[PDB]
């Protein structure tokens, strides 16, 4: 552990730019896998409607599918508003 600490201390002097570069790059590599908001970003990307939502033909066997936009069935965006 002493050699690594000595190397880090000697690099922080006379080479701070490279130390900052490697630190920032490593943090950018590591942090996204540990953050809990990346799932939120994925969900936000999912909830952006670029296309028309084509309706499905009702056969009396789709209780989860709403018949009107105001019906309580279907995905909700209350979580997005609370963000």
């Amino acid at each position: 552990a002493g050699r690594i600490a000595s190397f880090l201390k000697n690099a922080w002097a006379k080479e701070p730019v490279l130390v900052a570069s490697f630190a920032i790059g490593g943090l950018a590599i590591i942090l996204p896998s540990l953050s809990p908001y990346t799932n939120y970003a994925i969900r936000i990307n999912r909830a952006t409607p670029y296309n028309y939502p084509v309706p499905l033909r009702d056969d009396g066997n789709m209780p989860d599918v709403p018949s009107h936009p105001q019906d309580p069935q279907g995905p909700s965006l209350e979580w997005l508003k609370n963000l």
């Binding site: 670029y50 296309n51 028309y52 084509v54």
Partner: protein, 70 residues
């Protein structure tokens, strides 16, 4: 004595020749049949041979496409 200790009878060679001739005739017939079958398969394309690939239909996407007319 020479015939007894060095050679066999005529029937051995006779029947060995019969077997050899049968094998060779069968092989010749098979070769001709194989050539004809190859010609037919290459001309028609309806056999297991000479099958050239076409696009796999599992690659097609069957979904609404932001436009009603595909």
């Amino acid at each position: 004595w020479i015939a007894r200790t060095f050679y066999d009878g005529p029937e051995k060679n006779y029947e060995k020749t019969m077997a050899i001739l049968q094998i060779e005739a069968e092989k010749a017939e098979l070769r001709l049949k194989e050539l004809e079958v190859r010609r037919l398969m290459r001309a028609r394309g309806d056999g297991p041979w000479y099958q050239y690939p076409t696009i796999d239909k599992a690659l097609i996407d069957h979904s609404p496409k932001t436009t009603p007319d595909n």
